[PDB]
Amino acid sequence: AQGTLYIVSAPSGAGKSSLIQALLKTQPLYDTQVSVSHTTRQPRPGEVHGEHYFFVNHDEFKEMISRDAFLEHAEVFGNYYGTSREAIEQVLATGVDVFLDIDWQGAQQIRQKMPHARSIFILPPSKIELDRRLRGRSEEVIAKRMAQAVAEMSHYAEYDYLIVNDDFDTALTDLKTIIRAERLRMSRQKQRHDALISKLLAD
Amino acid sequence: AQGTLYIVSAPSGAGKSSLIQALLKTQPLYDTQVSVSHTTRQPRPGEVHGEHYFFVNHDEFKEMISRDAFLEHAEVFGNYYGTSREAIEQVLATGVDVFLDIDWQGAQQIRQKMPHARSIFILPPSKIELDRRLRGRGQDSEEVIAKRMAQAVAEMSHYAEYDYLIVNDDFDTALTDLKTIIRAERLRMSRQKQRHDALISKLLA
Amino acid sequence: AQGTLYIVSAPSGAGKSSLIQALLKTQPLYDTQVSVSHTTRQPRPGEVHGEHYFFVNHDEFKEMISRDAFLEHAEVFGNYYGTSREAIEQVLATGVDVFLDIDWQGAQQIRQKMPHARSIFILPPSKIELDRRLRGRGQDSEEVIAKRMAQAVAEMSHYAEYDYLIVNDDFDTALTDLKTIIRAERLRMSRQKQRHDALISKLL
Amino acid sequence: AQGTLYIVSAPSGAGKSSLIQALLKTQPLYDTQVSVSHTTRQPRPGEVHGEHYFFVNHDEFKEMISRDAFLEHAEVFGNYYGTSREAIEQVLATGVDVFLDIDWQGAQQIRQKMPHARSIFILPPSKIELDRRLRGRGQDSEEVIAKRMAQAVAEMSHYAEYDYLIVNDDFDTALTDLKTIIRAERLRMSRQKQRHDALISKLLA
Amino acid sequence: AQGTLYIVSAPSGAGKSSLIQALLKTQPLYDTQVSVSHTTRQPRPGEVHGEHYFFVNHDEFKEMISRDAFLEHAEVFGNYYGTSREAIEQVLATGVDVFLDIDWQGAQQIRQKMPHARSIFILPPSKIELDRRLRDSEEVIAKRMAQAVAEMSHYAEYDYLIVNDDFDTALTDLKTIIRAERLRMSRQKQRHDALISKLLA
Amino acid sequence: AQGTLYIVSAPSGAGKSSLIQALLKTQPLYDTQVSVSHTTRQPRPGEVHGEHYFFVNHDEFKEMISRDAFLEHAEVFGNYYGTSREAIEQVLATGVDVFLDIDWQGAQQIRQKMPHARSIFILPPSKIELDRRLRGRGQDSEEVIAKRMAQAVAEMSHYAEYDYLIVNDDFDTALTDLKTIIRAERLRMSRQKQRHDALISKLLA
Ligand SMILES: Nc1nc2c(ncn2CO[C@@H](CO)COP(=O)(O)O)c(=O)[nH]1
Ligand SMILES: Nc1nc2c(ncn2CO[C@@H](CO)COP(=O)(O)O)c(=O)[nH]1
């Protein structure tokens, strides 16, 4: 029962991170999972293969790049990161919804190799708030992060849904809503309620 | 800017009626509205022009039929009933969402003249429940029931023609599913881009 | 299948009235309805036969008393009020839940004639609040209040006779407790076995 | 001065597990706690006596069987498992509600030595969904599945023996149904009469 | 035995009207009522003295104006409308919360004589939305929009500010302000007198 | 942006602990955080400086006491514990709301150096329930209970000193009351005027 793939993107300081987290805490694994990426970097203390990432050796990662195994990948200051098309494809095949957290670039790539995916973009409520959230806990470092954020936000129009994260809860509800709504699509419902519809039409 | 048009259909005994009602009680007029039909029949005690129907004289109704003013119409045992395409189009123009309650036939026609509209189909949770709900107050000839049940099955055959399917098992849950479809659509990019024009402007500098 | 009959009682000033009202505004007629009583009094402006009451003439009401047609009845300062047993029985038969608002006396009678009914009692959160609520618009003689307060204490004495007890401190919470009692009962095996006949069949 | 004991059972693939978990995350320990069984098997890495199980030696377990100390017990491929009538009686004695996750067999035993317990049965929404959930991660032999599916159908046969039936279609709704059953029971007269002793006193005076 | 008085103001097109309505539909009369105004106009079919309005004769209404009995009043195309200072004062005395819908001017006046008033200001989510909701001749609109901006200038004078983006959320914010106030110590100390007594004994 | 400081106090057995916990699980860090105290005691296994406490040496702690660096402090059987005026002040400066769990004494001190802070007091629903909750697992000498119950009554005497009073009858409702107090405060004009600077600007131009 082909599940849906959600590409979620947002400039640092909108909650993209937290929201997806919160969403999964109220969703059974047979309903919603998060996408798991492949990486060549050493797992940190506490991490675990299969959950956080799919830790593979540098050569394995390359063997894959060659055979077009990744839906998207990129080398980030040292190591490689990638979204195995077979990994996300397998789970979606079991009727599970998958959430993929990526930047606008990877978004475009995935959205290209997979037109059925839905994409959600989260935005901060105002520039002051974006600023405040970014400053988190040098005026020079901030100015850079703020700029990187504006860059990211430029691609907002490329997405399917737009969530403005003013108040966290409301935002988490908007997210939950997008999911639920999609699950109410005819293709999906026709599948889920096969038995019921059969009975109803048959005398 | 442009609001969405929702075509809602369901066999008698699924709540199509009640659900739309309940939905509007929690929605301001600048957000959501039920469509209002044009009729030639005399208003009953308590009704009011503009709310329940658009009461017009037999000739006015005909003048409209001619100028293709109706999105759909039909003569039911005596009088004429119609959904003015103007009356809708205009309100969609003010950014309001419009709910149109119609049978599968009219659904197809509208879905034809306005291929932007979204359509929702409501279904009963089981045959026993559909039956129970249909039997209503519980005082009808086994003969009348058998007919209504048949008319319902006919209606349900077209379920696959719709965009969304809601299974009305528990009323509340169903009213939430409905509310959800609406809210979700309002989160579409085209819509959000419009609503938050000012914000996005500021953000991009 | 067979719906449940809820006998709801409470001393004036706990919200028994409002709560049942609020409950029905969020419930379709094929799941929960309120019980409609018979009365001989003239309908007031706005009322309507079939919804608020079953307005019958003084003689019709008596013809019924004789044939043990009422589940309970009583003559209140002038007119007669009654709960047609044929009426509540026909409705429960369609799987609808019926709410009957009555005093402790009528409660006992119905609970007698229909041991399958569930009963809920609503109480005020404190004596001060009961008092406050009773004083209503704050325009009554200290004498009238003292009487109403007494009538209330009388009523509350029978609380232990009921199945569920709801303490109406905050309205919403109370309306949720009510809703909860209903929903829970609907989750009983007998009920669920019926509702999901088809599903269980397929599963086994 | 008296809590309720909830026997919860369900075929693998309905969420019985998850639901009880979720329920406890929103319930203080003086309100709701889980049951703790007695077992003779060696504790696994990470387990701890008093929380997961009450690890006792093979002879201790037998000494109890004799003195009718268990509400129910059974020997499962090697070791003994049991629900101490007293261990529970203690907690229940502090006004805490206890949730006992067991199979239909154990259910019958407990339901026998404590006919004051309430029982809840959780069911999957359809056979396709039960199947889908059972297939889990999706990496098993069509042979293993066919077995687990059969074990599930067996389990579901005893559904009618229970007090409440929850159909786990949508997780949240199910978790609410569960929460509801609890809350409702807590509204019973015997319970409320206790909790609001002081208030009722004042009111009748 | 003391309720709060809520002064609610907002520029036309924020929902001030609808929100207060919606609030009362989920609130019992012994908790939160709305202010009943005095009027000289004839009651319409279905209305009733005491509930919708306080129907008084033209002279009675004047007798009051003179003795500064009204908190505010105005003559609208024919009749007089007023909010009796004594009518509110009586209901707050029964522990009921009262909602007063008024313009910024009347707000200032009430905010000056009456002990215990909280004020809430509702605002539209954006200018486009305010415009959309307001929308007639381009001439009439331009006027209503201007009257709105005037009104909004006094937002800072209020205690709470609600931004009505999505109706529901707004109705929740409103409900929240109320509930929160009811959790104030003075209030709670009263409501739970009996409980606290028992606890400390 | 300037955040609010919440002083939360309650007699043992009202849930003060649990409630604050539950509150933070549904609140992002850029909105709500908990207060980190300074202490002179040795960190236990698993603890970490910056998260659980601010572990400082006995002399450092004294150097602070002198310069009125603490909002409140007290020496508990051996070591010193304190709430740094600057630790809180810093975060509050980033627009985050801070929750401080303390006894009535420390409450008074903080409320005195920061008269802007809001204070919330949680109470048990009745004496029986307070008792029941205090008795905990139910394994304490009638002597130990009588003491804890007395310490609780002492604590509750200062309830009137607080801003908000929450009666923890049912956990959920209580957690909602708490959440409500927070939300409401965030709707204060000073706060809203800040958060919606941009919007108000546009609206008035
Ligand atoms: N292109 C691409 N980049 C990724 C992917 N996953 C993570 N990244 C980005 O790389 C790092 C952040 O720069 C990942 O974060 P970290 O190093 O904290 O685990 C991925 O799947 N594809
Ligand atoms: N085909 C068609 N039937 C309608 C329309 N409106 C109403 N009907 C069906 O007619 C019945 C209403 O359910 C007649 O109206 P009433 O029940 O108010 O007398 C319409 O717009 N098109």
Ligand SMILES: Nc1nc2c(ncn2CO[C@@H](CO)COP(=O)(O)O)c(=O)[nH]1
């Ligand atoms: N026993 C009994 N008393 C009723 C019934 N209905 C109303 N009463 C009692 O009288 C009143 C409530 O005390 C209702 O009359 P009213 O609401 O018209 O004032 C009823 O159905 N049975």
Ligand SMILES: Nc1nc2c(ncn2CO[C@@H](CO)COP(=O)(O)O)c(=O)[nH]1
């Ligand atoms: N009769 C009985 N069986 C139990 C009890 N607890 C567990 N079982 C059965 O144990 C098997 C699971 O069905 C093995 O447990 P697990 O593999 O989850 O550790 C108990 O308390 N009583």
